[PDB]
Symmetry: C3
Subunit: 151 residues, 3 copies
């Protein structure tokens, strides 16, 4: 009877938290984030070379943007369009030239290369940028691109 | 009786979640948001024309800032003062000249017009900006103003 | 009886909230926050003189960064390094020259003064900045430094 009165209070608390949390997620994602499935992309809103970008994401407890499907790529592309700045992806062929891999070593399960890419231009393009059109180009890791992490 | 202790435990968990959420919400709003009642304003920190600004808020699951009381207006004014950039409100008289409405079509329930406003200057001011002094002015929708959404 | 079904239901809702929120904490703190123990530092990303910075933090429901241990200081240092801008701490000897205190009036429980500091250079350094190397220097409160609040 008193337990029932307290379960009712606890029900009220949980329902309030569900509503407040849903409101808060919207606020957080505006304007630098995108939710797609169970993944969230967030941009830092500035540019860094690959190594520095990579470390920013890992230290934040995530990793560089790693679009694994067309839906993930479109969500990422919204951030790129919004900032009007091409972004680094996480993937490189630093280990084996011509074989792009995730930071875990896993081979790519999805790609969205621009026509003729990857072309290892100048024999030194081992990182990947995503353009405002969502297409990918291999690019030198030392260039500065928009930092976008995934969580 | 063991159900009572299950309730005790779950309530401690919910109360810890309430505390963590409250902390993260304060962090979230600093420095680009303001809460007032159950409403949260958040600025994107850049300027856009009205149509673009409206779309950003709608796509984010909110709407352009729509202060409905002196308290809401003062909260919004804080962000405007902080960015030192006048902001668009959601309201327009596009449908019937001289009759400002919310996106839903409902007539205003609160206004804070600067003296002499609204005046439809040039015969073509159908949007509303809020100044750093918190007063409002009708302004051409094509002008660029600070994007502030409400959630 | 049906109270057990309700507690079971709440358990599932709480687990979902906990998991969802855990992800959002990482997203929210990227790139402008740092968690350390139960404290969170968050930078505004811009510079202000002391009084203005202090007001920003207090109005946001927090206070200026107040590292109370080496671990807290190191965490604050990560933001300072990231932004590459020295920041104000909360502490001053404005009341009694040579005695630095927190806003509450309590004497320091931790300090990381650069050698020879505090030196009240020019007879007028009553505020404290933290450098990118994590060391502290007393500095004129009128100077503009990175705004970092704690929550
Ligand atoms: C030969 C060629 O077509 N190079 C492309 C692209 O693949 C390179 O990554 C880029 C390097 O600036 O130049 C180019 O835009
Ligand atoms: C007649 C008048 O005072 N117009 C004001 C203001 O109301 C207008 O919106 C603005 C348009 O640029 O000019 C002005 O600053
Ligand atoms: C005399 C001296 O060593 N001054 C230091 C430092 O303590 C001062 O705060 C600073 C002020 O610009 O000059 C200096 O960098
Ligand atoms: Ca190579
Ligand atoms: Ca290559
Ligand atoms: Ca290429
Ligand atoms: Ca008109
Ligand atoms: Ca008009
Ligand atoms: Ca006008
Ligand atoms: Ca003094
Ligand atoms: Ca002094
Ligand atoms: Ca000094």
């Amino acid at each position: 009877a008193s337990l029932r009165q307290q379960v009712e209070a606890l029900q009220g608390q949980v329902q309030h938290l569900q509503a407040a949390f849903s409101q808060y997620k919207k606020v957080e994602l505006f304007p630098n984030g995108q939710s797609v499935g169970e993944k969230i992309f967030k941009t830092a809103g500035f540019v860094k070379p690959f190594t520095e970008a990579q470390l920013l994401c890992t230290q934040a407890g995530g990793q560089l943007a790693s679009p694994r499907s067309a839906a993930e790529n479109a969500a990422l592309q919204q951030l790129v369009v919004a900032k009007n700045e091409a972004a680094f992806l996480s993937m490189t062929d630093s280990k084996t030239e011509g074989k792009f891999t995730y930071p875990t070593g896993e081979s790519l399960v999805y790609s969205n290369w621009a026509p003729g890419e990857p072309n290892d231009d100048g024999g030194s393009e081992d990182c990947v940028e995503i353009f405002t059109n969502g297409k990918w180009n291999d690019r030198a890791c030392g260039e500065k691109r928009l930092v976008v992490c995934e969580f």
